[PDB]
Paper text:
GIPC1 (GAIP interacting protein, C-terminus 1) and its two paralogs GIPC2 and GIPC3 are universal adaptor proteins that bind and regulate vesicular trafficking of many transmembrane proteins. GIPCs contribute to the endocytosis process by tethering the cargo proteins on endocytic vesicles to the motor protein myosin VI. GIPCs contain a central PDZ (PSD-95, Dlg and ZO-1) domain that mediates the interaction with the C-terminal PDZ-binding motif (PBM) in cargo proteins. The transmembrane receptor PlexinD1 contains a C-terminal ‘SEA’ motif that constitutes a PBM and interacts with GIPC1.
We determined the crystal structures of the myosin VI-HCBD in complex with the GH2 domain from GIPC1 and GIPC2, respectively. There are five copies of both myosin VI-HCBD and GIPC1-GH2 molecules in each asymmetric unit, arranged in an alternating pattern. The group of five HCBD and GH2 domains repeats itself in the neighboring unit cell, yielding a continuous array of alternating HCBD and GH2 that extends throughout the crystal. Considering one GH2/HCBD pair as a unit, the neighboring units in the array are related roughly by a five-fold right-handed rotational symmetry and a ~22 Å translation. The bivalent interactions between the GIPC-GH2 and myosin VI-HCBD are mediated by two distinct interfaces. Interface I involves the two loops in the GIPC-GH2 domain, one between helices α1 and α2 and the other between helices α3 and α4. These two loops interact with Arg1084 and Arg1085 in the ‘RRL’ motif on one side of the second helix in the myosin VI-HCBD. In addition, hydrophobic residues such as Val1088, Tyr1089 and Trp1092 on the same side of the second helix in the myosin VI-HCBD dock on the hydrophobic patch formed by Tyr275, Met276, Ile278, Leu283, Phe311, etc. in the GIPC1-GH2 domain. Interface II is formed on the opposite side of the HCBD with helix α4 and the N-terminal end of helix α3 in the GIPC1-GH2 domain. Interfaces I and II bury ~1300 and ~1100 Å2 solvent accessible surface area, respectively.
Residue numbers in the entry:
A (entry chain A): 260 to 333
B (entry chain B): 1050 to 1096
The structure:
């Protein structure tokens, strides 16, 4: 699960910020893996990584991406 | 500009930077592009 999730997310990082970080991306996978909707994910991202000002579409794609990992969509 | 430039993708920013001739939009994108790296700097040095 988690390894493929981090990739999908880290790619979403690069496409947002221009940089890449398998750690920061993994923080986010871990944060929202066990949530129930993109808002719960958003609330947790806001806790630590608040200053990024991550847009809704980003928080959607990460919700989407992590979802795809539990399914096997890779 | 009175754009919400936090919605933009990194591609988006870099592209309008070396395409647009709108000086206001330019400085605005150049600033956003900066912000995100500045914020990433602050996160890196802590963890």
């Amino acid at each position: 699960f988690e390894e493929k999730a981090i990739e999908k997310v880290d790619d979403l990082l690069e496409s947002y910020m221009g940089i890449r970080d398998t750690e920061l991306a993994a923080t986010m996978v871990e944060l929202g893996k066990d949530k129930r909707n993109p808002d719960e994910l958003a609330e947790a991202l806001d806790e630590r990584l608040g200053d990024f000002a991550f847009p809704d579409e980003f928080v959607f794609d990460v919700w989407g991406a992590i979802g795809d990992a539990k399914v096997g969509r890779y | 500009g009175s754009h919400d430039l936090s919605k933009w993708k990194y591609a988006e920013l870099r592209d309008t930077i070396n395409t647009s001739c709108d000086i206001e939009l330019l400085a605005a994108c150049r600033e956003e592009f900066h912000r995100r790296l500045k914020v990433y700097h602050a996160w890196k040095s802590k963890n």
